[PDB]
């Protein structure tokens, strides 16, 4: 059974994601600051070399970060016990509908009220610079800080987060799932271990569990709104292509 589930998810998380909360918090409190157009261009020479209007370039650099995170989330998912045994079409469905929820949950760790890390913590981009972008690009930025400031007030650590992200992936009501039963049972196991973990990791936050359940539905809405802006950008900005990985994930979402 599952007295080992929490350890396996936690180990898979630390092993697969290049950035985590301890590293993020230590770095946040030195990284090159992008606060204006001239520092953007510096960072693009120095930090983003391998990766043309500014907003579009920023849009591009964000999506490169998603491509890489999706790559890490797939490897993390295969290490969740039970996941590799699902039908490959179900595996695809779970990652497709779950990756962005997981992405924004995790992005929260590198964000504070003033900005966020970039290029593996080698940089920091300020919240005000992001707000100065022209629409619609500015609009994909601030709602994430709004969400992050509130998710971060819960003071989760990496171990809570690993269980949380596993719960987001193994989610039994994604559309078109071939075998809901097996996935719902993975889910119940993870959510059970999560509940117990939050009890012993945070003994005085009586409502953290239900609070996190709520964060799940909130991330859902957050992704729906994000996906809608990305669709607007895609149909109305001739210079903003979406990476083909991102394009499959986003296809059919509404």
């Amino acid at each position: 059974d599952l007295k080992s589930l929490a350890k396996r998810i936690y180990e898979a998380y630390l092993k697969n994601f290049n950035m985590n909360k301890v590293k993020a918090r230590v770095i946040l409190s030195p990284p090159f600051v992008i606060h204006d157009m001239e520092t953007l261009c510096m960072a693009e020479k120095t930090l983003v070399a391998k990766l043309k209007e500014a907003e579009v370039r920023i849009f591009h650099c964000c999506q490169c970060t998603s491509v890489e995170t999706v790559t890490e989330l797939t490897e993390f998912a295969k290490a969740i016990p039970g996941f590799a045994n699902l039908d490959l079409n179900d595996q695809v469905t779970l990652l497709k509908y779950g990756v962005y929820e997981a992405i924004f949950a995790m992005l929260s760790s590198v964000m504070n009220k003033d900005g966020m890390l970039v290029a593996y913590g080698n940089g920091f981009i300020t919240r005000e610079f992001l707000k100065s972008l022209r629409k619609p690009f500015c609009d994909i930025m601030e709602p994430k800080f709004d969400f992050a400031m509130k998710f971060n007030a819960l003071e989760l650590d990496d171990s809570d987060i690993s269980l949380f992200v596993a719960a987001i992936i193994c989610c039994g009501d994604r559309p078109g799932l071939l075998n809901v039963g097996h996935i719902e049972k993975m889910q119940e196991g993870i959510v059970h271990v999560l509940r117990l973990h939050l009890q012993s990791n945070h003994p005085d936050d009586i409502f953290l569990f239900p609070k996190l359940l709520q964060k799940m539905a909130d991330l859902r809405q957050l992704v729906t709104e994000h996906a809608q802006l990305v669709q607007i950008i895609k149909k109305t900005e001739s210079d903003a292509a979406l990476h083909p990985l991102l394009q499959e994930i986003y296809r059919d979402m509404y």
Binding site: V70, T71, T74, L88, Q91, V92, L95, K96, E248, I249
Partner: peptide
């Protein structure tokens, strides 16, 4: 979902 299937 060629590329997602590709990762998996």
């Amino acid at each position: 979902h060629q590329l997602l299937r590709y990762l998996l």
